[PDB]
Design a binder for this molecule. Structure first.
Ligand SMILES: Nc1ncnc2c1ncn2[C@@H]1O[C@H](COP(=O)(O)OP(=O)(O)OP(O)(O)=S)[C@@H](O)[C@H]1O
Ligand SMILES: Nc1ncnc2c1ncn2[C@@H]1O[C@H](COP(=O)(O)OP(=O)(O)OP(O)(O)=S)[C@@H](O)[C@H]1O
Ligand SMILES: [Mg+2]
Lengths: 69, 420, 325, 373, 107
């Protein structure tokens, strides 16, 4: 369930729409409901836990609070 | 040191300092920098920390030649003499054998001449025993890598000792060098600083020219009209058209971004106006002047244009007879590499397919007594003349029939120059 | 050409092989082996008597003879001859022919020091080896006849001793009466080594010894594919944890389809696949830790841009369930 | 603000706890365990044992245990010379250090009968020296033989990069012989033992030494391919001068140096539309996958430009300069390869780092190369 | 090459003439128009075609390249290029931007 959205995040991270390896919280909110999967994105706590389980598997960590490394 | 006293002689009979002589004095490649301004700090702030803290680090810079990396690191250490170290220029290509740099280091600590073996013993004995400061430049690192990497492992293993009073500065040709020649065990020791130097840009290439043209651009000379001697009877001026300087920049930054190539094409274009000025008046060697755009148009092209086309049409007849036979086989067979006997087979056939007065002369220089020649006159000569010219190429065989011949220049331009 | 191959074999690791091999070679046919060894023991006085005649004794036969020669030379003969001449006993100089590092210079430098340095033979040291031994021979023709040295040459068809400039060197040694030459070979084409010139210098005699020994020491230098699928089996046990995962994703779709080229994967999609599990950032970060699989020759590439593993169909699932999992 | 970060750049490890068990007889003066210490490179492993012996020598009874670096020998003699240097004596050195049996006479001590252990540093220079089963494996074989009868034995501690060396051992040696067994490896510390040493190497702590979770972020997103976190702090020490120069920020600065020209800055290299034409001309000559000369490329350049008359055919000398514009950006490399007719003769073969997938995007925007394809 | 087959023959030209005559015969006309030959050539090219199964400054670039192919001078004094841009249809702001872009591209 997170592999398809991780591949979507990776193919959107492949271009210069984030302009770095990092990406803002505004682009984080822009890439969850405005994109293709509808009602797959539940509450703030489970996607923050999804970013944390991507973080210990070295995919998407949490730093500086205005962007997300 | 010693013999520069003996390199001086006395009689200097008043050499004529003309208009363009004083340009080439400052257009010499010798004498803060605009282009690599901030990266000078990135070296220096990496260097200033280790110097004033008694450590051992490594600094790795790369780039194409002509970008100042020979220059910039000399400007690093130069100001540092004002504020504990021993400066050495360990050039890679200036070592005859690669082990000979080892002799220099042990020479440049106390003054002893020991073998490459015995130096690095005491060098290793230095680098882990001395209680507590050495700056070393490892220039042109393509030379000292070639044999078996056993030299290159040493020059970074000395950096690992915390009791090693040394600061190394490597300058290479390419950033790729510890990834396509060295091992990973060296690549751990090289670090990951990796300060990249790009080319120069054409705006900065204008900003490097006028640094040489600081006190002399559009200035005035004092000139006698009789000898052509200029002094910083008329009082003439000389101006440099900046647009021609700009079109010098927009090519050299485009192809190479080389700081020698930019200065030298200005230096070559300067002397074109020198001889044309000497042509019109003849002051020899004993209203307002300028340098046109038309000078740098020629001299930049003078870097490009060839003559092998003009060489071929100014060759002998049997030379042009030879190549025309050679392209005939290459379009007959399509194999681009023909046997030598078949060419001698062809030049016979290309006779009979004025021609008789040719064919008399083509096999004997007149003379009824000594005619009837198999291969043509001077056939060894033109084939030797086409060989050392670099146009042709012929593999070595004692058989003078089945030795193959390969072209070395493009065969179309050979076809094209043949048409004249 | 459906051939059964050694790759399609149930393989055996290092400690598993050598221990059960050591069980057989010390317990298979133990009783009849010493039963042979007691039978041939009565031949030992016969060898002592013929060897006084300066006869180059040569032992052929199946099986290793290395243990048998060292019992016969060291313990039996070398003190027996010293007692029968009348003090340290007779010096034994073995030559391990199965050891390929035997040269002609080094062993002869031992020989002239093993033999008497009665004169300044270092003066004649200047290839003077045949020259120096010729001056040794004619002097030895007029000496009192007694053995002072016995040399042993194990595995005379060995990788260095069978070289021809070394063979003729031993030929001139054998004509001397003071030294007894007890050697063994194992080759089936060993009498191709000598003509009637050398055997004139040799005067060989022959005896069979066949104890069907396992050749423990003589198996060590030799190698087969037991001694790569097994080579890269150890590098993966010490790497980063990410390389295990990116090889796991490599090994799956490369075994999704022997392991040949056709089961391989394109570089672009594999970059996207290892971007899908948040592993590969881009091509460079993929390729750099893929050059480490390239540098230890753990994967191949041919042309789609196909990277494929050169191990078999059976091997990759063994690499799956054991080291990757 | 300098002196807090001037000091920034400079028992202690959780691997030393292993080796005191592995040296469990080194304080009871008996022969210890069997020590062949390997490692993947960069993992601190050279200074790891150096940390142990320096903590051994500063702790430790008569005290003489020496360590030498096998770099510049290629030959097994002068190691046994350097163990004599802790004696400060004089003897006949050449024979005693050459033969296997000559080492055995050297192992009778003089003053108080303290046993000696040698440390062989950087053994892989002699492993990856000259041909294996002739000299170097024999050199490996001869050193690991400890069949000496008194407990004064030359215990080896050797080190290597690549882990093929155990299978290189002969089957006799792999029968539990000498110091080969305990193949103590060191997996590369992700962040869980190396970063905590950096914490204790921050004993003298400045106030702003940066948000340490970003340092934890630095450790987690460097541990893909790394082994040396102080050196990967030496890339933090360069970025800590960036915040001094401006009075994982730098890993972001360094990767865009490497990733670009194929996706975006290919057209940066070819502002000339003819440079776009000459770049496709190279790939059309790559059909004949041969030694791609500057002439065979010039052959296909003329014979296509006479068909489609997009420009006039230019010079070979121009063709020399234009392909060097393709060179300095880093797209195509030129090498002087081999042709063996008369001598080693050097024709120039090129190679391109672009693919047709990254070609076809940037040419459909320009229909003037569309005749040429 | 690889996807090629045969060559153009005069019998194919005669067949094209015959197919145009058949197309004119199907329209019951006494003359052959231009509509039959363009249909017959489309027919003979689509008979083998089944095997495969803006210009905002580019126009100014082609105009500059036409003037560069007749004389070949990259001067700084443009007096004819500005007149053909004024009679070509577009403005001068795009012309000045194209001049600045190709002077930055150094043509
Ligand atoms: N920024 C600059 N300011 C002034 N002079 C410069 C500058 N850059 C280069 N030069 C001059 O041009 C010369 C070119 O030499 P460098 O570029 O320093 O050598 P390089 O770049 O290392 O090329 P090498 O030595 O063959 S690798 C220098 O010696 C200076 O004389
Ligand atoms: N866990 C650690 N504890 C203390 N210092 C360490 C540690 N890890 C790394 N270092 C230091 O950082 C350096 C990095 O290791 P390297 O020397 O580059 O690799 P190595 O020590 O040569 O091991 P190799 O590459 O297998 S020979 C070490 O030499 C130590 O100075
Ligand atoms: Mg240097």
């Amino acid at each position: 369930r997170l592999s398809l959205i991780s591949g979507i995040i990776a193919r959107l991270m492949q271009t210069e729409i984030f302009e770095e390896e990092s990406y803002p919280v505004a682009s984080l909110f822009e890439r969850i409901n405005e994109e293709l999967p509808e009602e797959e994105k539940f509450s703030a706590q489970e996607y923050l836990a999804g970013l944390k389980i991507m973080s210990d598997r070295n995919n998407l960590m949490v730093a500086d609070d205005k962007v997300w490394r | 040191s010693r013999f520069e006293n003996k390199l001086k002689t006395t009689q200097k009979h008043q050499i004529v300092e003309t208009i363009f002589s004083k340009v080439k004095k400052q257009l010499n490649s010798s004498y803060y920098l605009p282009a690599r301004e901030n990266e000078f700090a990135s070296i220096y702030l990496s260097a200033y920390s280790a110097i004033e803290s008694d450590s051992a680090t490594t600094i790795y810079v790369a780039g194409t030649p002509g970008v100042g990396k020979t220059l910039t690191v000399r400007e690093v250490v130069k100001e540092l003499l004002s504020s504990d170290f021993l400066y050495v220029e360990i050039n890679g290509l200036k070592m005859v054998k690669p082990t000979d740099c080892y002799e220099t280091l042990w020479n440049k600590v106390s003054g002893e001449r020991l073998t490459w073996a015995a130096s690095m013993e005491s060098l290793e004995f230095y680098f882990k025993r001395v209680p507590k400061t050495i700056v070393v430049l490892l220039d042109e690192l393509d030379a000292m890598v070639t044999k078996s990497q056993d030299i290159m492992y040493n020059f970074f293993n000395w950096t690992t000792y915390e009791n090693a009073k040394l600061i190394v500065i490597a300058v290479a040709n390419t950033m790729d060098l510890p990834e396509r020649q060295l091992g990973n065990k060296i690549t751990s020791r090289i670090g990951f600083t990796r300060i990249m130097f790009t080319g120069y840009t054409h705006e900065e290439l204008k900003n490097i020219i006028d640094l040489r043209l600081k006190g002399l651009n559009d200035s005035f000379f004092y000139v006698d009209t009789k000898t052509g001697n200029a002094i910083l009877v008329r009082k003439v001026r000389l101006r440099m058209s900046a647009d021609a300087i700009e079109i010098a920049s927009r090519k050299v930054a485009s192809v190479s971004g080389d700081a020698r190539r930019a200065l030298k094409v200005c230096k070559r274009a300067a002397e074109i106006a020198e001889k044309h000025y000497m042509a019109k008046h003849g002051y020899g060697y004993d209203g307002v002047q300028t340098v046109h755009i038309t000078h740098v148009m020629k001299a930049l092209n003078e870097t490009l244009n060839s003559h092998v086309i003009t060489f071929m049409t100014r060759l002998s007849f049997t030379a042009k007879l030879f190549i025309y036979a050679l392209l005939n086989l290459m379009k007959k067979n399509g194999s681009q590499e023909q046997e030598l006997g078949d060419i001698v087979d062809e030049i016979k056939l290309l006779i009979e397919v004025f021609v008789m007065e040719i064919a008399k002369t083509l096999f004997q220089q007149g003379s009824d007594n000594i005619s009837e020649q198999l291969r043509i006159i001077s056939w060894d000569f033109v084939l030797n003349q086409l060989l050392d010219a670099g146009i042709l190429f012929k593999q070595t065989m004692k058989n003078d029939r089945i030795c193959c011949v390969k072209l070395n220049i493009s065969v179309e331009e050979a076809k094209r120059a043949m048409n004249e | 050409k459906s051939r059964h191959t050694m790759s399609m074999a149930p393989d055996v690791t290092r400690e598993e092989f050598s221990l059960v091999s050591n069980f057989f070679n010390e317990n298979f046919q133990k009783r009849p082996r010493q039963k042979l060894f007691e039978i041939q023991k009565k031949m030992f006085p016969q060898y002592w008597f013929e060897l006084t005649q300066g006869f180059s004794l040569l032992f052929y036969g199946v099986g290793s003879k290395r243990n048998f020669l060292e019992e016969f030379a060291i313990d039996y003969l070398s003190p027996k001859i010293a007692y029968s001449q009348l003090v340290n006993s007779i010096p034994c100089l073995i030559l391990n022919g199965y050891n390929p590092s035997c040269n002609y210079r080094d062993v002869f430098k031992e020989i002239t020091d093993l033999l008497v340095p009665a004169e300044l033979t270092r003066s004649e040291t200047k290839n003077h080896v045949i020259l120096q031994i010729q001056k040794m021979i004619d002097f030895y023709k007029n000496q009192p006849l007694d053995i002072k040295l016995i040399l042993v040459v194990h595995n005379l068809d060995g990788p260095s001793i069978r070289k021809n400039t070394f063979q003729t060197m031993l030929s001139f040694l054998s004509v001397i009466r003071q030294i007894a030459i007890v050697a063994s070979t194992d080759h089936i084409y060993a009498p191709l080594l000598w003509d009637n010139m050398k055997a004139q210098n040799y005067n060989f005699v022959f005896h069979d010894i066949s104890n069907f020994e396992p050749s423990t020491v003589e198996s060590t230098f030799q190698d087969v594919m037991k001694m790569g699928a097994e080579g890269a089996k150890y590098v993966l046990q010490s790497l980063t944890v990410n390389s295990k995962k990116m090889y796991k994703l490599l090994i799956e779709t490369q075994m999704q389809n022997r392991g040949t080229q056709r089961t391989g994967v394109e570089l672009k999609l594999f970059n996207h696949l290892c971007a899908a599990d948040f592993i590969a950032s881009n091509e460079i970060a993929l390729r750099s830790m893929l050059r480490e699989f390239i540098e230890h020759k753990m994967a191949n590439i041919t042309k789609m841009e196909i990277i494929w593993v050169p191990y078999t169909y059976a091997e990759l699932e063994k690499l799956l369930k054991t080291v990757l999992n | 603000k300098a002196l807090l970060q001037k000091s920034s750049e400079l028992a202690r490890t959780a691997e030393y706890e292993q080796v005191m068990n592995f040296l469990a007889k080194a304080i009871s003066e008996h022969r210890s365990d069997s020590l062949y210490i390997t490692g993947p490179p960069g993992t601190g492993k050279t200074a790891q044992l150096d940390m142990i012996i320096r903590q051994k020598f500063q702790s430790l009874e008569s005290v003489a245990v020496t360590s030498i670096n096998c770099i510049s020998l290629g030959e097994p003699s002068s190691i046994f010379q350097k163990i004599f240097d802790s004696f400060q004596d004089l003897n006949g050195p050449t024979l005693q250090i050459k033969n296997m049996q000559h080492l055995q006479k050297f192992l009778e001590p003089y003053h108080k009968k303290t046993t000696f252990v040698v440390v062989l540093d950087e053994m892989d220079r002699l492993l990856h020296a000259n041909t294996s089963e002739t000299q170097s494996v024999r050199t490996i074989l001869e050193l690991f033989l400890l069949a000496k009868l008194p407990t004064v034995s030359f215990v080896l501690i050797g080190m290597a990069n690549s882990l093929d060396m155990k299978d290189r051992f002969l089957s006799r040696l792999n029968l539990d012989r000498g110091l080969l067994p305990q193949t103590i490896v060191f997996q590369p510390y992700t962040a869980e033992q190396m970063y905590e040493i950096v914490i204790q190497k921050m004993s003298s702590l400045p106030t702003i030494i940066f948000q340490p979770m970003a340092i934890k972020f630095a450790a987690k997103k460097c541990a893909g391919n790394t082994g040396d976190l102080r050196k990967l702090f030496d890339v933090l020490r360069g970025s800590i001068e960036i915040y001094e120069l401006e009075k994982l920020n730098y890993i972001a600065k360094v990767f865009s140096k490497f990733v670009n020209n194929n996706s975006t800055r290919t057209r940066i290299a070819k502002l000339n539309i003819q440079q776009k034409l000459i770049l496709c001309t190279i790939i059309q000559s790559l059909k004949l996958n041969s030694d791609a000369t500057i002439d065979e490329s010039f052959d296909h350049y003329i014979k296509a430009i006479t068909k489609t008359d997009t420009l006039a055919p230019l010079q070979r000398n121009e063709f020399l300069e234009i392909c060097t514009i393709l060179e300095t950006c880093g797209l195509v490399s030129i090498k002087k390869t081999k042709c063996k007719g008369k001598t080693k003769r050097f024709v120039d073969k090129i190679d391109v780092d672009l693919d047709m997938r990254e070609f076809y995007d940037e040419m459909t925007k320009i229909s003037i190369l569309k005749p040429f394809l | 090459s690889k996807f090629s087959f045969g060559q153009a023959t005069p019998r194919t030209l005669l067949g094209i003439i015959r197919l145009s005559q058949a197309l004119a015969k199907l329209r019951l006309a006494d003359m052959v128009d231009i509509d039959d030959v363009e249909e017959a050539l489309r027919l003979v090219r689509v008979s083998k075609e089944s095997l495969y199964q803006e210009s905002p400054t580019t126009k100014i670039f082609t105009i500059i390249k036409k003037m560069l192919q007749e004389t070949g001078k990259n001067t700084l004094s443009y007096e004819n290029i500005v007149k053909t841009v004024r009679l070509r249809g577009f403005t001068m702001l795009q012309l000045s931007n194209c001049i600045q872009e190709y002077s930055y591209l150094n043509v």
